[PDB]
Amino acid sequence: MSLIYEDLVKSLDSKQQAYVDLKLPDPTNGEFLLAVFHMIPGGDLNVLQAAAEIAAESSTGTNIKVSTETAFSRTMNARVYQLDLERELVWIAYPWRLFDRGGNVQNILTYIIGNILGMKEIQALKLMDIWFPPSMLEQYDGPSYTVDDMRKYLDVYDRPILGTIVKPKMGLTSAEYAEVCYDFWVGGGDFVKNDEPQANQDFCPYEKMVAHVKEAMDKAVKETGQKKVHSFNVSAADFDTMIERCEMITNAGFEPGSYAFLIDGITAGWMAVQTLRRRYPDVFLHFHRAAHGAFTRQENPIGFSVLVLSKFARLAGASGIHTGTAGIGKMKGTPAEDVVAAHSIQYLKSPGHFFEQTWSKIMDTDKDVINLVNEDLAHHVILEDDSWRAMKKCCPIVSGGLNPVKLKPFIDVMENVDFITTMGSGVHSHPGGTQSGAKALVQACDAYLQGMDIEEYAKDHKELAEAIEFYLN
Amino acid sequence: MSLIYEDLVKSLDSKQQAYVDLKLPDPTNGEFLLAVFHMIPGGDLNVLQAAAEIAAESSTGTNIKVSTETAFSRTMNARVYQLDLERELVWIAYPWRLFDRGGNVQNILTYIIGNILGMKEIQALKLMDIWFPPSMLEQYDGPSYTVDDMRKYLDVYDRPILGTIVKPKMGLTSAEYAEVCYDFWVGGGDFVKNDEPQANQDFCPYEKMVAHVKEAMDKAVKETGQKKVHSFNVSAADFDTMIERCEMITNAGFEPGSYAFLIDGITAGWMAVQTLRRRYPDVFLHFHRAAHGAFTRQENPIGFSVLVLSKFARLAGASGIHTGTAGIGKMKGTPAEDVVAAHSIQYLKSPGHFFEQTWSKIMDTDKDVINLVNEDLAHHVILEDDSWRAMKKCCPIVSGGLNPVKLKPFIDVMENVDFITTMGSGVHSHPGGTQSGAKALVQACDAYLQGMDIEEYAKDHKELAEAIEFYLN
Amino acid sequence: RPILGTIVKPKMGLTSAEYAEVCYDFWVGGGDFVKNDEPQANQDFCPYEKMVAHVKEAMDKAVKETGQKKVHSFNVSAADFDTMIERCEMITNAGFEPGSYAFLIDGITAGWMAVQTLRRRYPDVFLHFHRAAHGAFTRQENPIGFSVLVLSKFARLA
Amino acid sequence: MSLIYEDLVKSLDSKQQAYVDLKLPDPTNGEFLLAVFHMIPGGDLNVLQAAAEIAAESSTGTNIKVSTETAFSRTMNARVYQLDLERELVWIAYPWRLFDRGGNVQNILTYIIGNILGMKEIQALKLMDIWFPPSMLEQYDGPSYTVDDMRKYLDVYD
Ligand SMILES: O=C(O)[C@@](O)(COP(=O)(O)O)[C@H](O)[C@H](O)COP(=O)(O)O
Ligand SMILES: O=C(O)[C@@](O)(COP(=O)(O)O)[C@H](O)[C@H](O)COP(=O)(O)O
Ligand SMILES: [Cl-]
Ligand SMILES: [Cl-]
Ligand SMILES: [Cl-]
Ligand SMILES: [Mg+2]
Ligand SMILES: [Mg+2]
Ligand SMILES: [Mg+2]
Ligand SMILES: [Mg+2]
Ligand SMILES: [Mg+2]
Numbered sequence A, B: 001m002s003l004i005y006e007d008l009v010k011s012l013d014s015k016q017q018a019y020v021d022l023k024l025p026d027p028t029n030g031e032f033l034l035a036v037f038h039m040i041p042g043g044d045l046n047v048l049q050a051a052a053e054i055a056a057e058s059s060t061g062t063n064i065k066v067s068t069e070t071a072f073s074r075t076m077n078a079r080v081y082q083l084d085l086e087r088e089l090v091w092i093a094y095p096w097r098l099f100d101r102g103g104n105v106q107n108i109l110t111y112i113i114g115n116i117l118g119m120k121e122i123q124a125l126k127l128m129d130i131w132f133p134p135s136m137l138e139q140y141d142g143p144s145y146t147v148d149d150m151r152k153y154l155d156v157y158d159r160p161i162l163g164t165i166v167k168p169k170m171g172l173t174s175a176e177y178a179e180v181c182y183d184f185w186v187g188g189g190d191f192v193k194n195d196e197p198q199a200n201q202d203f204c205p206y207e208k209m210v211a212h213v214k215e216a217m218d219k220a221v222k223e224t225g226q227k228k229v230h231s232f233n234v235s236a237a238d239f240d241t242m243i244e245r246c247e248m249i250t251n252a253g254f255e256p257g258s259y260a261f262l263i264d265g266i267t268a269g270w271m272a273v274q275t276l277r278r279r280y281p282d283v284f285l286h287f288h289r290a291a292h293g294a295f296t297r298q299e300n301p302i303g304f305s306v307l308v309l310s311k312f313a314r315l316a317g318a319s320g321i322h323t324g325t326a327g328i329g330k331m332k333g334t335p336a337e338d339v340v341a342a343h344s345i346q347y348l349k350s351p352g353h354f355f356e357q358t359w360s361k362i363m364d365t366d367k368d369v370i371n372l373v374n375e376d377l378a379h380h381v382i383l384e385d386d387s388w389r390a391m392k393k394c395c396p397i398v399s400g401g402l403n404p405v406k407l408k409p410f411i412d413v414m415e416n417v418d419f420i421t422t423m424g425s426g427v428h429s430h431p432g433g434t435q436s437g438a439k440a441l442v443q444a445c446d447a448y449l450q451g452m453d454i455e456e457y458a459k460d461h462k463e464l465a466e467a468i469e470f471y472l473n
Numbered sequence C: 001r002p003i004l005g006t007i008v009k010p011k012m013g014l015t016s017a018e019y020a021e022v023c024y025d026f027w028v029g030g031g032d033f034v035k036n037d038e039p040q041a042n043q044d045f046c047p048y049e050k051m052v053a054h055v056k057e058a059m060d061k062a063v064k065e066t067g068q069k070k071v072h073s074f075n076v077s078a079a080d081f082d083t084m085i086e087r088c089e090m091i092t093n094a095g096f097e098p099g100s101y102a103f104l105i106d107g108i109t110a111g112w113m114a115v116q117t118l119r120r121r122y123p124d125v126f127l128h129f130h131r132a133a134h135g136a137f138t139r140q141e142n143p144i145g146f147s148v149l150v151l152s153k154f155a156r157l158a
Numbered sequence D: 001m002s003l004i005y006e007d008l009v010k011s012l013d014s015k016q017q018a019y020v021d022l023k024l025p026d027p028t029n030g031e032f033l034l035a036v037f038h039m040i041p042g043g044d045l046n047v048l049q050a051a052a053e054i055a056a057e058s059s060t061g062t063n064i065k066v067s068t069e070t071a072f073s074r075t076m077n078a079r080v081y082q083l084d085l086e087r088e089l090v091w092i093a094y095p096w097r098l099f100d101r102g103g104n105v106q107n108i109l110t111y112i113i114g115n116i117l118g119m120k121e122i123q124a125l126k127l128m129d130i131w132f133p134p135s136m137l138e139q140y141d142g143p144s145y146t147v148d149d150m151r152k153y154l155d156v157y158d
Helices: A003-010 A047-057 A105-112 A147-154 A174-186 A206-224 A239-250 A270-279 A306-316 A335-346 A367-377 A404-414 A434-449 A454-460 A462-472 B003-010 B047-057 B105-112 B147-154 B174-186 B206-224 B239-250 B270-279 B306-316 B335-346 B367-377 B404-414 B434-450 B454-460 B462-471 C016-028 C048-066 C081-092 C112-121 C148-157 D003-010 D014-018 D047-058 D105-112 D147-154
Strands: A032-041 A079-084 A089-095 A122-131 A161-165 A191-193 A229-233 A259-264 A284-288 A302-304 A320-322 A395-399 A420-422 B032-041 B079-084 B089-095 B122-131 B161-165 B191-193 B229-233 B259-264 B284-288 B302-304 B320-322 B395-398 B420-422 C005-007 C033-035 C071-075 C101-106 C126-130 D032-041 D079-084 D089-095 D122-131
Touching (some): A032 A105, A047 A089, A147 A161, A147 A284, A161 A434, A174 A191, A191 A420, A206 A239, A239 A259, A239 A270, A270 A306, A270 B239, A335 A395, A434 A454, B047 B122, B105 B270, B147 B284, B174 B434, B239 B270, B270 B306, B335 B395, B434 B454, C048 C071, C048 C081, C071 C126, C112 C126, D032 D105
Parallel strands (some): A229 A259, A320 A395, B229 B259, B320 B395
Antiparallel strands (some): A032 A089, A079 A089, B079 B089
């Protein structure tokens, strides 16, 4: 085994022994959800003892062996099966029979990123990656409406979906809000999203915002001759107010496919996400992630990675989630963290950080799955008539202090154009305002698509020229 | 102003100028939600420029001033009004007109601990404290069912409510679960709670668990002549499953006051917390906080404090919330954090960290508020017939690696007994089992109340003597 | 010619998604009929509601690709009368093309009352009688019981 | 282990080895429905190959190992874990996860006293006893009305 490992194993209590199995036959057999954590002990206990306590507390156990313990309960124990003592990593196998039925995501998180995060026996504890076996992946929903469905509605292919966020973040009225929408759309933009805290403030009655946005869209659609989309912030105080807001939009007379529902998944919760997925499965569910920084940032030893968050959004059924600008914009931080996460939600097969994931439902050795993976890499729309085989894609939403000049840099690190980009400041701060602001973004996209440098395309494209002058000088 | 504070103000952009008012006349006038963050800038920006940036992003702004901005929108800018450069603290005033109506708590959190946690222009960002003006508090629910109401039902006063959590955390069946309930209650325990991830697993049908607990309670109540409570985990995949589980308990048909509803508030979400408060206002709402460590853990420089979590739980209407053992048990970590938070939710008037909080609704100078406060400090039940005057009590739940030998030490740090304590491993791991574990916990409470040393009290109480032997070895 | 069919194997262990792949593979390779292995039902890892759904999708594709109509015989055996009709009604509203589904009942373990309930409630669906446990009655080594002739004749009468 | 049992183990094919564990560490752990059959083989096959074949057909297996088999399906395999060769008895452990949910009894009997009764490879196959772990009993109804309730209506006692 190794002298060190045999000694670490001899150091375990009768309690700890039950949450360790460094000779686990097949972790990828289907019985388990696999997890890897960055872990650092917080004194008294050694690495294997601390890993055995973390496993106990995220599964069936507690601080001391209890008299109420059964033999059947021991079969549900999570078990430490692998360790990297240099990189300080811990591999724990979680029996997915531990999880609450009916496809509950908050329950998985209650175990693997719950109570364990507050244990004084750890100094750092970051959940880095997880593996969902086909047997478990089948118990959850997964996305029912995707970016492919949106693209079919918009008729927008082989480029990113060009979006904006209505800015100011707060303070505009329901009339002023709709003007910002109209101007972005009519200027050539595709998608408008509500800034995350914009809801029913006394000066912007939700009922009026919805009616004006519907009128504004109708105008932009007739003038441009092109379909447009609005992602509405549907987060509320409670279940009933959210549904009241969903139904306001649902009954406003929008053309099906032209409206999406945004939810602040971290603050509103994973229950509001699943509710929306299940109640409105033919509407694009946009997961905004405000407050994830406590979990995901480099500076924080305790929490979870952006890959984990992104993977759980796809499992829960989010049509899209914000994955970051790989540090090109205003938020932290890198292509290593952000593009790995985007690829885990975009593709059928991905590396990603520690566990390679194929989002099938059936075995990845079946010729038909191998085909789907190949077809996926060729940029063909899959799972239209064979949904049972795999979980559908969850779209990256790239936002955070971007502008037309930061587009080509982001696509280069991304290695593809199957994402939604949203630029607030980068559009509404433009010298000529939102319409010119939108044209600059459109122009920078056309430049990229026809292999040109923006400075060369800008020679006969005023809005992009002004943007380059403004966003650099 | 001062030499350095002058230079810092001269360094601000026309945009950053808009989110700074160091000469704010009256921050406590009632227009603002006051907040204080611990903050360190992350290169390129100075303290005031970073603070102006945070303020913009947590109210009405973005990284560049926008053409779409209005004079009316500027009225709602959050303002940096005070600093402590040595202690690295910044005070920001948030107009509560920013916040969504209908008493939406997730929307507050979306601004003040949302996107700003992810900004690369900070190294640390920890929200330490908040101040709710009487005007704002009236727009929120606050608790409707309190520990005063549960103590009335139970007929338990002048001591903590002594409870347990059913252990194993997972693996027991619905019938095995009900035996652990009965044994604790019949041994002298008041309160039984579902361990946070306990729900509808395949081997513990929720419907059977509920029915056996109904029967188990009746047997225990009848044998002890003493009323008992059960806190059920109603956290589910979605809204509709949660109400179905709540409604299953509602018709079980327990005696009113004998059941509470538990919600994994962080993972389930604030919308779930609010839904239960508004839907079941005459049921004790129990806020379990699994996953809070990402935000509240000292090792993490980005997030928010335990005081803040606890204060927003009372605002949303939890009848109780977990506050910690002040580092006496297995979680992190101190009286400075844990007792301050408890006191904020227990009492009408509190210090707490940076803002003194009187939870009135009306002006803290009315002689009637002064009386409520004097009466509260005397441990007299308030707000039975004058609820309009102030927001009600939110109960500290003290859990995490405690045993009867750690009961006194916590009370000494707490400075009172108005709380619920749950001991899972400290009861079920008793060498005599759950019934002896409960007897040991009851005996330790009596020893504390009587002012007797446990080692002395245990000379004529075997279950306590056994606990002292076991838990100190 | 004979109707060429399969039984989804393994007998137990596949999920509802995996089950439907086996169905698709058989029908697309030229097979006509797929039946549930007799003890395949609503086990925790193969939700019956999901199985019916994926089988409806799997079939549609196999019919489109082969240009040939296909059939699935669904194990409708349950704990009781009410659960059995719940399963039947799930299939009845899934919504398959009439003729493309049959109902399978373990007539010895479930009973002759389950066999007659399905005949009378669903007269326009093929009633597939599976005889698991008949060996105690029919087996030549057993002196007491009844013949395969008797069992088969009574099933025709029912 | 014993030379008689060692050669009996060595006779097992790849498929049969999957449904045998004579070293099952805890058959009463709660995961299994324990069974004991009085069995005699049907010629060609020995005691343990016949047992491993019965175990196969009573759980997840079939005559020949299949391409469609998954690692997750092998976890629900019934395992032969004890033998009394003189008494002609074989003990099989059945994962209760195999059985149809909602406390369906018809289904338990379709596995443990179904198709296996008609198999060529046995002369005798009598299920003598079974053992229900507490985890399993809680998934089933059990009686609601009893003779203690009848005796109270009747006032008939002792
Ligand atoms: O509020 C903002 O800052 C944004 O609207 C972007 O506005 P700008 O386009 O004006 O920067 C987004 O909410 C953030 O991108 C969220 O971060 P992430 O996508 O990283 O979750
Ligand atoms: O699962 C647990 O660990 C507990 O049930 C305690 O059990 P023990 O009594 O066996 O430790 C609680 O959920 C934690 O105390 C929560 O932490 P906090 O109270 O800090 O939110
Ligand atoms: Cl080991
Ligand atoms: Cl100033
Ligand atoms: Cl063996
Ligand atoms: Mg925003
Ligand atoms: Mg295939
Ligand atoms: Mg717990
Ligand atoms: Mg007065
Ligand atoms: Mg069969």
